Design an enzyme around this catalytic site. Structure first.
Site, PDB file in Angstrom:
ATOM      1  N   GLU A 543       0.816  -1.205   0.000  1.00 52.94           N
ATOM      2  CA  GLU A 543       0.000   0.000   0.000  1.00 52.94           C
ATOM      3  C   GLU A 543       0.858   1.267   0.000  1.00 52.94           C
ATOM      4  O   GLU A 543       0.460   2.286  -0.556  1.00 52.94           O
ATOM      5  CB  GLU A 543      -0.995  -0.007   1.166  1.00 52.94           C
ATOM      6  N   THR A 590       1.936   7.607  -0.690  1.00 56.63           N
ATOM      7  CA  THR A 590       1.101   6.421  -0.619  1.00 56.63           C
ATOM      8  C   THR A 590      -0.033   6.364  -1.630  1.00 56.63           C
ATOM      9  O   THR A 590      -0.834   7.303  -1.755  1.00 56.63           O
ATOM     10  CB  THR A 590       0.518   6.202   0.817  1.00 56.63           C
ATOM     11  N   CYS A 591      -0.006   5.258  -2.403  1.00 59.96           N
ATOM     12  CA  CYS A 591      -1.280   4.572  -2.773  1.00 59.96           C
ATOM     13  C   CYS A 591      -1.264   3.758  -4.059  1.00 59.96           C
ATOM     14  O   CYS A 591      -1.169   2.528  -4.038  1.00 59.96           O
ATOM     15  CB  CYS A 591      -2.491   5.539  -2.775  1.00 59.96           C
ATOM     16  N   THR A 592      -1.330   4.482  -5.167  1.00 57.35           N
ATOM     17  CA  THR A 592      -2.187   4.053  -6.270  1.00 57.35           C
ATOM     18  C   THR A 592      -2.100   2.640  -6.844  1.00 57.35           C
ATOM     19  O   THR A 592      -1.212   2.319  -7.667  1.00 57.35           O
ATOM     20  CB  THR A 592      -2.224   5.069  -7.409  1.00 57.35           C
ATOM     21  N   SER A 593      -3.046   1.810  -6.354  1.00 51.89           N
ATOM     22  CA  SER A 593      -3.758   0.950  -7.372  1.00 51.89           C
ATOM     23  C   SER A 593      -4.815   1.838  -8.087  1.00 51.89           C
ATOM     24  O   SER A 593      -5.679   1.322  -8.800  1.00 51.89           O
ATOM     25  CB  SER A 593      -4.440  -0.267  -6.698  1.00 51.89           C
TER      26      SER A 593
END
EC number: 2.3.2.26
Length: 620
Positions: A543, A590-593
């Site tokens: 993540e 932080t993140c991207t799917s």
């Protein structure tokens, strides 16, 4: 004094001292184990107890009085409480992942625990009289008593209350999309739901189970939605309610009738012409029997939807977790299918089953399956259990010539006709399986181009394996992985752009060397989405960490597409915004799917034909 009345820290320290003496072999007086009115608010017990207290089969907290205590916001995950009293206590928003309560009195407690809890808590030889519990628990060992006269607990908000024996469960106020998922969908919530909770009760309480379920169904009916809202959970609903003892309830059975029919109709619309994903244990035990029952109630669908029918029968016969009853019912239904006027002609004396117009289910090499053509009345396919398995879930090396083509009471020749052409005109499910194999083969070829089997055997195999699952236990974010990936992808991206040589290799692998700039761009877009997925939290990323080499490569794929045919994109700065989120300006923590989701949504909209032919199926 086994005692102290100060802060939570002070309470927690007295408890640890007492529990450590207990572990030392000391027998504590009841006075030493009296923690009535204890304040344990915000305590993380794993930080104050020896590791042995949180291990599988480790130490246990035995014989304590925690009457009217406050455990609010504490973390009691992986603890085991035995012979304790929790009467009147507040466990509101307590983290209790895999916490066990055995031989305990947990009466009149507030147990709407924190949703940050992973594993359900379990209750063994424990009473929960008038206790409000979150609707996700293992109640396999709870002791139930006749409910009293009391009012439901006093609460800040939410819906009405139902009894589960003498336990209280709170319903949602409305059945929104969110509430439907949180209460009913155990399929998308790691096997947790109110349905599974009520069903975990011992069989001696079948009466209480049915009653509680009737009360939930009453709530559900009492302002149900529609097909769009029940649709995500039709499967979860039938997985529990279409089996005993809920079959004996006139109320549940009446409600379930239309829900199961809608479920079945949906399966017919989705999987008549597309292979059913290989059923797991849950599907074999809880869903397959439901599908058999639906086909039994609507015998016409057997021949109208023989694609789905044959698949269901196949999986009932070959699933390692199917009951004997499921296999027998499947065989009984298959007999009716074979007796049908449209099927019986194709039953050919010298080739089918046992050769007496009945299949031989004692062997997988016997030709027990006949599949009607979707277009021509007079043509059928015959094949064994073994072959059908492989044609429905194709492997890299699966052949498409192991079947008999039947027509006019004859075994026809299949030489001088490609399986593809036959499938396209007559057998849609196999066209799909054939195309799936082709798509996997081509993606595999690209993997082999990027990651040679002779230098990077381990990674090539992992990249390949990741295409057949939604999630991965392999995370390529350690230093060795990052270093190795940089060595593989970076050299294909001079100045951050796809090397012309590599681009040509892609073209050859996907036979687009003669294709239009548009079909080339669309293919590159979809490949970019694929590698964005590799880099997401679901596959090789976490993540908070996404392998930079995979992100750079996905970005360059998208850049070349933009170069080839910009009109395929929705906008100028839409291209820019995705590019930015691929890049780590050191401001993207932080993140991207999210890049993968957004891009994939755009692909399904404008070129869903290219996307389905490029993306691995499991990622669709």
């Amino acid at each position: 004094a086994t005692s102290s009345p100060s802060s939570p820290a002070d309470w927690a320290k007295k408890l640890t001292d007492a529990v450590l003496r207990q572990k030392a072999g000391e027998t504590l007086t009841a006075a030493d184990r009296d923690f009535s009115n204890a304040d344990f608010r915000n305590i993380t017990f794993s930080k104050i107890l020896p590791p042995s207290f949180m291990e599988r089969d480790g130490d246990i907290i035995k014989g304590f009085n925690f009457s009217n205590s406050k455990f609010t916001y504490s973390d009691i995950s992986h603890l085991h409480f035995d012979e304790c009293r929790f009467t009147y206590s507040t466990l509101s928003d307590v983290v209790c992942s895999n916490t066990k309560f055995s031989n305990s009195d947990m009466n009149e407690v507030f147990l709407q625990y924190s949703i940050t809890t992973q594993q359900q808590p379990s209750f063994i030889d424990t009473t929960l009289k008038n206790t409000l519990i979150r609707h996700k628990a293992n109640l396999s060992g709870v002791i139930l008593n006749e409910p009293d006269n009391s009012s439901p607990p006093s609460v800040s908000g939410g819906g009405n209350f139902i009894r589960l024996g003498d336990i209280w469960l709170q319903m949602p106020l409305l059945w929104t999309e969110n509430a439907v998922d949180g209460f009913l969908n155990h399929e998308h919530n790691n096997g947790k739901s109110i349905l599974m909770t009520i069903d975990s009760l011992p069989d001696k309480y079948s009466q209480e189970k049915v009653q509680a379920m009737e009360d939930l169904v009453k709530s559900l009916r009492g302002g149900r939605l529609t097909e769009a809202c029940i649709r995500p959970v039709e499967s979860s609903l039938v997985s529990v309610l279409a089996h005993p003892p809920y079959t004996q309830s006139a109320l549940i059975s009446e409600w379930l009738g239309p829900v199961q029919e809608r479920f079945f109709a949906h399966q017919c619309q989705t999987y008549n012409d597309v292979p059913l994903p290989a059923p797991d244990t849950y599907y074999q035990q809880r869903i397959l029997p439901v599908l058999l029952d639906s086909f039994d109630r609507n015998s016409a669908a057997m021949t109208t939807h023989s694609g789905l029918f044959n698949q269901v029968i196949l999986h009932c016969m070959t699933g390692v977790d199917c009951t004997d009853g499921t296999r027998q019912k499947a065989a009984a239904l298959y007999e009716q299918y074979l007796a049908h006027p449209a099927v019986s002609p194709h039953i050919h004396n010298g080739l089918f089953g046992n050769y007496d117009g009945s299949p031989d289910w004692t062997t997988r090499a016997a030709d027990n399956f006949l599949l009607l053509s979707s277009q021509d009345s007079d043509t059928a396919m015959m094949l064994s259990t073994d072959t059908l398995l492989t044609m429905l879930n194709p492997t890299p090396d699966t052949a498409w010539d192991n079947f008999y083509l039947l027509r006019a009471g004859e075994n026809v020749s299949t030489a001088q006709i490609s399986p593809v052409e036959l499938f396209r005109h007559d057998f849609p499910v196999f066209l799909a399986a054939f195309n799936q194999q082709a798509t996997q083969r081509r993606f595999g070829e690209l993997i082999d181009i990027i990651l040679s089997t002779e230098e990077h055997g381990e990674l090539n195999q992992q990249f390949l394996a990741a295409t057949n699952q939604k999630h991965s236990t392999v995370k390529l974010i350690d230093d060795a992985s990052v270093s190795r990936l940089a060595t593989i992808f970076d050299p294909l991206l001079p100045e951050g752009k796809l090397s012309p040589a590599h681009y040509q290799h892609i073209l050859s692998a996907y036979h687009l060397t003669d294709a239009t700039p548009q079909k080339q761009a669309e293919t590159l877009f979809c490949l970019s989405t694929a590698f964005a997925r590799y880099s997401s939290s679901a596959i090789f990323g976490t993540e908070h960490d996404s392998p930079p080499a995979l992100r750079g490569y996905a970005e360059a794929l998208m850049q070349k597409a933009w170069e080839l045919s910009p009109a395929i994109f929705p906008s100028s700065e839409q291209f820019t915004e995705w590019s930015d989120r691929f890049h780590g300006l050191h401001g993207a923590f932080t993140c991207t799917s999210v890049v993968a989701d957004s891009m994939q949504r755009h692909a399904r909209k404008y070129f869903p034909s290219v996307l389905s032919s490029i993306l691995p199926l499991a990622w669709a």
